[PDB]
């Protein structure tokens, strides 16, 4: 039903396309199959060279916190962490700093960012932390800035994972290793997604990634409507390549490809990893593709378009004129690849400070009963291994932060597990930073950082230490990892046990959570002995020194939640992860657009902490909502353009034109300076529409006591539109639109109406 | 044979004595027995009050690194550590800083310093680390300065332990607890010590303590010639109170007293702890003493002299006019004493910097093959739990640093175990300090700090980490404790195992030893993969930041060994610790004056590292020895004077007159600034005399490249004398005296002769 549309180079890539087409028109069939399937090298993926035309191998490298598996680089905080800052400037700079290091390590294509897959359908998603917000609009924006950041350095982006990749359980990558094949055990989970939900929820952040100029897109492990994402014609040829007008390459996830011909015809451009990882994850193209073209079952022209889309990026970013230096690190690992590593340091001055600032900007205050900010306590207790180093070393858990023992004391959770992680040159531990500050105050400080259930004496130590303390810091964590979902919301390690002891022996307990996602603090959150609670997410290498200034009052906490914190897992969307032995496992997205806070608001469920909630050390009063109908503007900035049909289209016009801008005022109404993240939600009228939909945020910085600032919200056409499944286009529905503004999805003291 | 001589107040205490005598002449018998036996309180010992005469309870408090069992204080480095600096200025300042804190915590009498018991007869002595050098002269000097330091603050000193207390094994303190009495199992080890050895070896450092004005002296647990030290008339009434003319009090060690009448007549003044510690350690005086006086078996006058000697100190230090504040801490511990603690911070600005400076001045370089000082390594590995915190907290091992489990990862060994330890407000770990410095150099750094034998993965982690490192730091330790000797010289914990792995996977291994004494590094010391070796002893709270500047070259290492480092325990004095079940265990000091280096030199044994050995980062050339016969001076300074008979005595004259001064020159002959510790040894002629005897040291500070300085050695009469057992006096023997000067007991390039 959907033929494969040819690349034309779209907006910004027009000249790169032309050079790309020149080069591809010279290529033989043996060379087309080379560039378009992975070969063996030091990087996660490597396209074969076209050595006669002077085109080298492309290093395709993990991952969304920066080049994975290398020394000489920095461990940036995770997508989850930057989203929690709600600060567009840090979202950009994070990505640009990642890009610099990617480039300087010799990566042509970054396997990043994660731009909407997983988006957020389960809070138990094992790799959910790799993305940003559980919300199409906010994810959309963070995705735009992350892409832009990486491309503005020399690196091509492979935005991932397209699409509806919402559980790790039964993701079932193609693998055939030691005679058992995943095709023989179980098919990948089928995400069954209606057309409205696909357009309004899952496609939104990918459109943004496409607008920002992603050079490529990774197709996911899941099947969509019982068809593999990487050979889904409706997915890749229609929705991505026609409607979103995508001009770059689809890259398979590693084992994302299940067949040769359907993938060649339904939208895949690059077979990865091909000959790498021993060919264990399927090796469907290469010489098999040459043979398919020469015997005439696969169009040679079709395959030229694949090569065209791979080279467009190469030429647009100027990788011919300004090549990256050689990649020097064995990031695959022996015995799978025996090969020696060189060494390069790419840590630039500024980067460490940026990583810190992100941490200081993200850490989210969930509860404060008066214990914070700390003045100058004299006797300080610290509990939890999370407070200090991994007992085996910061990088002991290996190339993907996932090979340490089940019970190992891993230390401060600075990134999650999997392909999304990265090595660290050190960890500034929360204990080191608390101690530095205790020393300044001539105070004492003592940590119990062992396993409190299993190490002799730990329990008695904690009993002996806590009573005399002015403050007890308890550091908790929750490791999760690619390739599995969390079974429940319960804390990692000895966390529950720590918290029972802590509140048994101290009435001034301050809780800090390093985590990949929501966790169960129900037993203690309303204990008055727990005086304060903060989530620091995954702060990367600067964990301790980003946190302590916030604790001590040097800066007010300013982060707010990028997803919903429900009291129980039962309060979320049902069937968030499906567990079957069924050969063809199915996940029917019956919830529709209603994920995260949309689920909560539609069904009248009260979270513990809502989407976009965060405490400061001061308060903010909202006033003087203004809807400026006259403050509208054309769509100029975008690197690339989509072809999303929409009803109001004429010759010169766009779905991303700003049709009005909204203003409001905040006043710092408390007794301290703070920054505030203002949020704007629109209720679009219609049948089965969410109560509220986030369509703007804006972060006021360091607003002094009693001062005021205006907060500004440009609204796009798309931002007020619905998808018509009958007409197959975006339209702006007739009706009354509620527009609300405030500190969170549930603290919105200003509202007005807008009718089109 | 030896009657108890009456106090007269000697030199400096004459006016205190008079006030003391006034007060005691008013006292009833019930009051004399009160002041003179211990009662229940918050301090290690407490004398009863004389409330009618306005005399309060005296807090007697542990210990030789500063007030034990308190919060709000600093953990000073140990006696062993300060001795290794060989710097008289730091020996003084250490003690004065301790004294300040003692005073400010409300201690009247400090159970410190350790001034010659144990001196050094075994290298396995479990509490050997509490003293200073294994050498009478050097110990003597450190003892003088330590006493002086504490008394110049408001605190009375209880110098310990008198005398020949040279093993912990069978020390057998009197205890009777739950119906088993130590009197029923085994008598204390009998130190059997000839008269020459007692005078020339064991009494020397106590004479110095007495000269410096110790207010009191603790009598030891051991027996001497099968008589309890605390009821030994020859010991306390003759040698201490007559010959050394001691004017202050003998205090029993806790369980040091075994009887009522002999102790009252043979020289004991204070029964400790009396009613404290449940009376479990003997309670021989109190009401029993009142009953002994009133029935006329103990002279009332004798007991008045006891009270006189206790009050002299009280009045001399001005504890009436300027009382210490209240002692506020329960340092005994529940259930033995149920009582609540208050809080006081006495940490003065300067103290932390002094503690650091001592560390930086003591750490001793034993081997350096070119790896030190470090330039700017980029990849740094660290091994050993000693590198980081105690996993249970710095103070988890309790009031005497000795209650943690046998296998517990205690972290950096900053002090030893027992009554000599102290709490710590923090520990600046070697890892923290190495990391700070790595960060400055844009480098990476990773530690494996778990148990390398028992924790899953640790071995693989170390294999994966070490090969790529520029440098591997391995941190080793050896805990020892009061009440036991070390069984052998072998490293604590996983140390052996660490070192096998380290040299298996790295050829640039730098070893740092935190320890209470000599340890066995024989298997690795000549491995060329071990590029450098340093012993940091017990640095107290500032371990990491005192060490790292030395490693990185900011200051050249300047410490030298305060004892001998033999290749095997068999190379030391035989029968260093006697192990019997024999009811009356015996230790016959047949070696004589020949302990530590004297044993080694007399028998032609080559240590690995000799007494007074230490490497710098530069070299020193010695020249131009001068013996100035005309540079002599009277004995003015001493706070108190002894009555040691000596042959050359006339009316006005003294054993501590300087009879000549010796000079030499050092030149910094290498390529860096360094400090040098010059040593002077005299060979006194006679029958069975040591090859060499240390009689001077002098530390030149920060001598620039190619510059020179004179090093100066005043020699006392006593310094050239022998004890005549026939005549019972100190005499200067006729004969030829060799005088040698140089960098160590075995690197003495200058020598001359002196004849009297
Ligand atoms: C299954 C898989 O995802 O493999 C890859 C290799 O390319 C894939 C991309 C992936 O991002 C990458 C690089 C990762 O970074 C993952 O975080 C990652 C994994 C998720 C992990 O894969 C798993 O845990 C699989 O569930 C696990 N699967 C199975 O054991 C399995 C075998 C037969 C049938 C069905 C399943 C597996 C373990 C070890 C090797 C291969 C497969 C292997 C892997 O070593 C890593 O795997 C290898 O390095 C590797 C794979 C095959 C052969 C040789 C090496 C992994 C790490 C780094 C730990
Ligand atoms: C035996 C002894 O030295 O006791 C004292 C109490 O005053 C002594 C002075 C000593 O310096 C002091 C304070 C210490 O600081 C020691 O480091 C110290 C010890 C060496 C230790 O003593 C021992 O380990 C003994 O070998 C051990 N001895 C025996 O178990 C024993 C019993 C009967 C016959 C023969 C031997 C012991 C353990 C616990 C209580 C009493 C005795 C007890 C003690 O708790 C500490 O002991 C107590 O606090 C205590 C003693 C008796 C009753 C109640 C409390 C210890 C510490 C702090 C651990
Ligand atoms: C297909 O790709 C391979 C792998 O990139 C090319 O072989 C490499 O070519 C480079 C130069 O581009 C050589 O330095 C390497 O030695 C080659 N590697 C290996 C493993 O052989 C190969 O030339 C490409 N084929 C064609 C037809 O261009
Ligand atoms: C997956 O299945 C859904 C459900 O059938 C598809 O939804 C239909 O899409 C067409 C246009 O493609 C519309 O005219 C129908 O009315 C849609 N139905 C619903 C219920 O939404 C969806 O497009 C399929 N997606 C893929 C990727 O195959
Ligand atoms: C420390 O990290 C390791 C991985 O490096 C964690 O071990 C994995 O935990 C998951 C559960 O999320 C299991 O499904 C895996 O099988 C474990 N991996 C291995 C290799 O055993 C470990 O849970 C972390 N430590 C703590 C205390 O959470
Ligand atoms: C013997 O000493 C005891 C203990 O120090 C004296 O009793 C204490 O006296 C102080 C004042 O000096 C009181 O505040 C305490 O309440 C007393 N403590 C106890 C436990 O009773 C006692 O007075 C002294 N006896 C004589 C005769 O002076
Ligand atoms: C312990 O025993 C030794 C050995 O008998 C005593 O040494 C004698 O001391 C007297 C003077 O007190 C001399 O005249 C003897 O010649 C000494 N003999 C030796 C072999 O040195 C020693 O004084 C005794 N010490 C104590 C503390 O009792
Ligand atoms: C950590 O310190 C503890 C004491 O706080 C050490 O345990 C003692 O070790 C000695 C041997 O020197 C035994 O005789 C004692 O019985 C032990 N004490 C207890 C209470 O069990 C321990 O050895 C130290 N840890 C390491 C690794 O050396
Ligand atoms: C606007 C919209 O979402 N409409 C419905 C849609 O159902 C489609 C649609 O009515 C039309 O194209 O015909 C088919 C075939 O009978 C029908 O399935 O999508 C949802 C289903 O999830 C409907 O409930 C909507 O009302
Ligand atoms: C100077 C000296 O040490 N002399 C000897 C001493 O032995 C004594 C001494 O000879 C004299 O007082 O008489 C008694 C009794 O016969 C004798 O023991 O000490 C040592 C013993 O350790 C002798 O070997 C010395 O020669
Ligand atoms: C690997 C390979 O050669 N595949 C062949 C293709 O070349 C032709 C076709 C028969 O027309 O059969 C396919 O299996
Ligand atoms: C336009 C498109 O791509 N898809 C279909 C098309 O079959 C139909 O003719 C159109 C009416 O405009 O409605 C959509 O359901
Ligand atoms: C505790 C006590 O009273 N001891 C007595 C002493 O008073 C008298 C003597 C007989 O003269 O006997 C002792 O045992
Ligand atoms: C003086 C002294 O205290 N002790 C004795 C003494 O018995 C003897 O008369 C004297 C000769 O001067 O020799 C010592 O052995
Ligand atoms: C790497 O070397 C190991 C032996 O150490 C061997 O098992 C393996 O075959 C090698 N790997 C490859 C891909 O050849
Ligand atoms: C709070 O802590 C105190 C100890 O400070 C304890 O006695 C009390 O039971 C605790 N309260 C709760 C609700 O846990
Ligand atoms: C201290 O209290 C405990 C009970 O917790 C008791 O066993 C003991 O008798 C008390 N100690 C003293 C010396 O009275
Ligand atoms: C020194 O280390 C290397 C690894 O760098 C190892 O191969 C060699 O066996 C080691 N030598 C000794 C003497 O331990
Ligand atoms: O780059 C991350 C993705 O690419 C590969 O490494 C894996 O297939 C995914 O986890
Ligand atoms: O002060 C130390 C000494 O005093 C008491 O605490 C014990 O008897 C000895 O170890």
Structure report:
In chain A, the strands form seven sheets. Chain A has a six-stranded mixed β-sheet. Chain A is globular, with a radius of gyration of 26 Å. The longest helix of chain A is centred in the first third of the chain and has 17 residues, at about 90-105. In chain A, strand 24 (about 720-725) and strand 25 (about 730) form a beta hairpin. Chain A is α/β, with parallel strands linked by helices. In chain A, helix 1 crosses helix 12 (about 300-315), helix 5 (about 135-150) runs parallel beside helix 8 (about 205-210) and helix 13 (about 350-360) crosses helix 17 (about 545-550). Chain A is built from 18 helices and 27 strands. At the A-B interface, helix 14, strand 14 and helix 15 of A face helix 14, strand 14 and helix 15 of B. The complex binds Deacetyltaxol (2 copies), a molecule of 2 linked components (NAG-NAG) (6 copies), a molecule of 2 linked components (MAN-NAG) (2 copies), 2-acetamido-2-deoxy-beta-D-glucopyranose (NAG) (8 copies) and beta-D-xylofuranose (XYZ) (2 copies). A molecule of 2 linked components (NAG-NAG) binds near residues 193, 224 and 725 of chain A. Chains A, B: Keywords: Carbohydrate metabolism, Glycoprotein, Glycosidase, Hydrolase, Polysaccharide degradation, Secreted, Signal. Chains A, B: Pfam families: Fn3-like, Glyco_hydro_3, Glyco_hydro_3_C.
